[PDB]
Enzyme design. Structure first.
Site, PDB file in Angstrom:
ATOM      1  CG  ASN A 173      43.274  39.430  44.594  1.00  0.00           C
ATOM      2  OD1 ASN A 173      44.020  39.131  45.457  1.00  0.00           O
ATOM      3  ND2 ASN A 173      42.193  40.473  44.830  1.00  0.00           N
ATOM      4  CG  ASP A 218      52.934  42.695  31.212  1.00  0.00           C
ATOM      5  OD1 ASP A 218      52.512  42.324  30.227  1.00  0.00           O
ATOM      6  OD2 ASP A 218      52.656  42.620  32.358  1.00  0.00           O
ATOM      7  CB  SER A 262      49.262  34.301  38.350  1.00  0.00           C
ATOM      8  OG  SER A 262      49.531  35.370  37.615  1.00  0.00           O
ATOM      9  N   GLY A 270      50.264  37.248  43.016  1.00  0.00           N
ATOM     10  CA  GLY A 270      50.221  37.372  44.483  1.00  0.00           C
ATOM     11  C   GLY A 270      49.077  38.748  44.644  1.00  0.00           C
TER      12      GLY A 270
HETATM   13  C1  LIG Z   1      48.583  51.654  42.801  1.00  0.00           C
HETATM   14  C2  LIG Z   1      49.973  51.051  42.769  1.00  0.00           C
HETATM   15  C3  LIG Z   1      49.752  49.525  42.066  1.00  0.00           C
HETATM   16  C4  LIG Z   1      51.087  48.968  41.890  1.00  0.00           C
HETATM   17  C5  LIG Z   1      51.030  47.798  41.302  1.00  0.00           C
HETATM   18  N1  LIG Z   1      52.223  47.062  40.745  1.00  0.00           N
HETATM   19  C6  LIG Z   1      52.418  45.952  40.381  1.00  0.00           C
HETATM   20  O1  LIG Z   1      53.642  45.264  40.258  1.00  0.00           O
HETATM   21  N2  LIG Z   1      51.227  45.144  39.949  1.00  0.00           N
HETATM   22  C7  LIG Z   1      49.793  45.651  40.293  1.00  0.00           C
HETATM   23  C8  LIG Z   1      48.750  44.915  39.999  1.00  0.00           C
HETATM   24  C9  LIG Z   1      47.337  45.455  40.398  1.00  0.00           C
HETATM   25  C10 LIG Z   1      46.244  44.748  40.084  1.00  0.00           C
HETATM   26  C11 LIG Z   1      46.415  43.294  39.486  1.00  0.00           C
HETATM   27  C12 LIG Z   1      47.587  42.893  39.059  1.00  0.00           C
HETATM   28  C13 LIG Z   1      48.590  43.733  39.371  1.00  0.00           C
HETATM   29  C14 LIG Z   1      49.850  47.017  40.758  1.00  0.00           C
HETATM   30  C15 LIG Z   1      52.205  49.584  41.880  1.00  0.00           C
HETATM   31  C16 LIG Z   1      52.440  51.015  42.844  1.00  0.00           C
HETATM   32  C17 LIG Z   1      51.036  51.503  43.114  1.00  0.00           C
HETATM   33  O2  LIG Z   1      51.157  52.697  43.541  1.00  0.00           O
END
Ligand SMILES: Cc1cc(C2=NC(=O)N=C(c3ccccc3)C2)ccc1O
EC number: 2.7.11.26
Length: 344
Positions: A30, A143, A32, A34
């Site tokens: 989760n 980032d 800001s 989405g």
């Molecule tokens: C496990 C997994 C996670 C993500 C995420 N991408 C993102 O932009 N942002 C993520 C995120 C996770 C928790 C809180 C905030 C951002 C996670 C992309 C591909 C994957 O295979």
């Protein structure tokens, strides 16, 4: 059980709409921005991550435009994207990847141990490859931090993710300085520079490396002032020349603190040297992503006999493209070792 079926647009191929079905939708993040869900594709039974974000009709989604043009083994791939509700939401279907450097580094940390150098080498190298790749298109992640570094424990493969802050940096145009997370921001960002280049990513990467070696963040602080002090404790006081090159138009004058004093005894000299060359006050003095891959600290990955601790082979490490090498082709003579050149 429940089964969702949507019509999506391929991530990179031509616009040939696909019918995609998936079940088992549980949440995995989760923020800001989405939500991010894990789901299981009906057909192949493959896992995927779906990142739901709000679609501000006013413009085109920049994350999407950047991800559609990327294709690299060390970058989470965008399979298809589709819009929907939940009032218009953009959904990015990406590859699912088990762990994150953040979590992994943490398991070793609250166990008084450190991640085996061999892994630090493998992970750092792949991060640098991904940076050399997106930087060649002029894109800056902005980032870079342990949580955006996904890992597959078994293969030791690393994939960079979260392009929600990524941007095409054009020389001359200014950019917000409030990007990048606490411990990983480059000095010029703290000083509020608005003309920073892609090197900020290298500084971040440097902080990740240092962290993996130390077992904790190297430049912590709840404020910029605190982070700067921690930086100055290690690099020393910035000469005016440097403060200038960091741009922004006066601190406890401290001197050169030999980096060997910074890391645990037994830390390989090469790891220490690579840090010193990444964490530099002057943005233009830092190695470039590609120059870093070719650094001596990575020579072990270039050995024909190298294997992972679990006995499997190391991931694809030398399949460089002209695109990737464009920042400096001559480097190929080092990046691609001899045994990788054997035809047969
Ligand atoms: C496990 C997994 C996670 C993500 C995420 N991408 C993102 O932009 N942002 C993520 C995120 C996770 C928790 C809180 C905030 C951002 C996670 C992309 C591909 C994957 O295979």
């Amino acid at each position: 059980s429940k089964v969702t079926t949507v019509v999506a647009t391929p991530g990179q191929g031509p616009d040939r709409p696909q019918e995609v079905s998936y079940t088992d939708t549980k949440v995995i993040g989760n923020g800001s921005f989405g939500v991010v869900y894990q789901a299981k594709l009906c057909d192949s039974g493959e896992l995927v991550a779906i990142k739901k974000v709000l679609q501000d009709k006013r413009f085109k989604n920049r994350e999407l435009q950047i991800m559609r043009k990327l294709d690299h083994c060390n970058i989470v791939r965008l399979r298809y994207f589709f819009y929907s509700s939940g009032e218009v939401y953009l959904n990015l279907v990406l590859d699912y990847v088990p762990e994150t450097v953040y979590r992994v580094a943490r398991h070793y940390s609250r166990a008084k141990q450190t991640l085996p150098v061999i892994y630090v080498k493998l992970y750092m190298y792949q991060l640098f490859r991904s940076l050399a790749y997106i930087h060649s298109f002029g894109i800056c992640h902005r980032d870079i931090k342990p949580q955006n570094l996904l890992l597959d424990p078994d293969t030791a493969v690393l994939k960079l993710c979260d392009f929600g802050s990524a941007k095409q940096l054009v020389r001359g145009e200014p950019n917000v300085s409030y990007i990048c997370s606490r411990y990983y921001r480059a000095p010029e960002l703290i000083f509020g520079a608005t003309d920073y280049t892609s090197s900020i990513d290298v500084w971040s990467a440097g902080c990740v490396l240092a962290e993996l070696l130390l077992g904790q963040p190297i430049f912590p602080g709840d404020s910029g002032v605190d982070q700067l002090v921690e930086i100055i404790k290690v690099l020393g006081t910035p000469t005016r020349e440097q403060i200038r090159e960091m741009n922004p138009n006066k601190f406890p004058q401290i001197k050169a603190h030999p980096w060997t004093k910074v890391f645990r005894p037994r830390t390989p000299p090469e790891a220490i040297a690579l840090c010193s060359r990444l964490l530099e006050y002057t943005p233009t003095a830092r190695l470039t992503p590609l120059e870093a891959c070719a650094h001596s600290f990575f020579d072990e990955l270039r050995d024909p006999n190298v294997k992972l601790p679990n006995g499997r082979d190391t991931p694809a490490l030398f399949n460089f493209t002209t695109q990737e090498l464009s920042s400096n082709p001559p480097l190929a003579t080092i990046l691609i070792p001899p045994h990788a050149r054997i035809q047969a």
